[PDB]
Amino acid sequence: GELDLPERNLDRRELRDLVNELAAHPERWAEHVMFPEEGGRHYASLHRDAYVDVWLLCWRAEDDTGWHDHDISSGAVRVVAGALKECNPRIGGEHLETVVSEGESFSFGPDHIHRLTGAVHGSVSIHAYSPPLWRLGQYSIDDSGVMRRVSVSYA
Template structure:
């Protein structure tokens, strides 16, 4: 939606129950996510621990710093969901994290 040298703003439409960001970080960016419509499943990860998660409903917002690892996906049955993401500095890349069979990140 918008990027300059300070913030970057994205709008993401989640139309399919199978859409999933996978676990990722935001490189050097901090930011926030606002759920504008629908409901998103948000899972936060700490290395060596199982992910913790919650359903984030329309109207709710969460923030993160540059050490945050998480994944997002639409809550099953929530219908069309829209999230607004703001990053500073603007998000240029993400780090991706794979899961082991036991659900942990090595």
């Protein structure tokens, strides 16, 4: 669908404001809540234009974004219901893990590498990106431990 947002990029603080205010306006997203039986994680587009993408994510316990960056996009997350783990990678291999629970939010600039997983079944969250999430990088590790980054189109 469409939100009534400005015709410019939003910075990470404005993205955080956006996801929190959307959480306070269930009229904008309640209809799109859905938890898939199988397939991938359920993601509903609330808004996609030249400046901002907004998605509503409904989580099963097994859902896992994998390690990824957002190329040039800043981002923010608000947990509406439930809880998620925000993970940040450490070269040593002892990664940073933070539980983000309902009511809480965070933002990040474009250099962010993270992984969201460990969700309470039935969790609901709102995610916003500016500039739009037209590209993301997905990291993988081979047999040997060697790390790669696959650039993915997500427009």
